[PDB]
Amino acid sequence: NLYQFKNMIQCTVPSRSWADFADYGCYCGKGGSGTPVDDLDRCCQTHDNCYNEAENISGCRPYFKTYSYECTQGTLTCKGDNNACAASVCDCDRLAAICFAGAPYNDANYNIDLKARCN
Ligand SMILES: CN1[C@@H]2CC[C@H]1C[C@H](OC(=O)[C@H](CO)c1ccccc1)C2
């Protein structure tokens, strides 16, 4: 669920608050369209596409589905006690959190004008 995703990010990128990723580029956050603006935005596009896939699973609501995961000692793990939906969503979030940590953050790309720049 989104609370868990926030915590994955807080755990893989403790140097930056999480709100830093909540409205970035064309894909991080509410946004979902256009040319990704940089590598971090690409991490968000993959994440967004991963959620759209998970939504194909019956009753599967990625923002809301509570899954089972752990973050400690630098490692994030989706646990084996996850159903198909939980496992899929947990995987999307884990991959995105890892991606976020490896991607440069560009202050210029925070809170861009989606309507004009993401067609
Ligand atoms: C309800 N939340 C979603 C749609 C609008 C808001 C904020 C969104 O934020 C994100 O999509 C990013 C990137 O996945 C994110 C960053 C930090 C916490 C939660 C989500 C998801």
Ligand SMILES: [Ca+2]
């Ligand atoms: Ca999005």
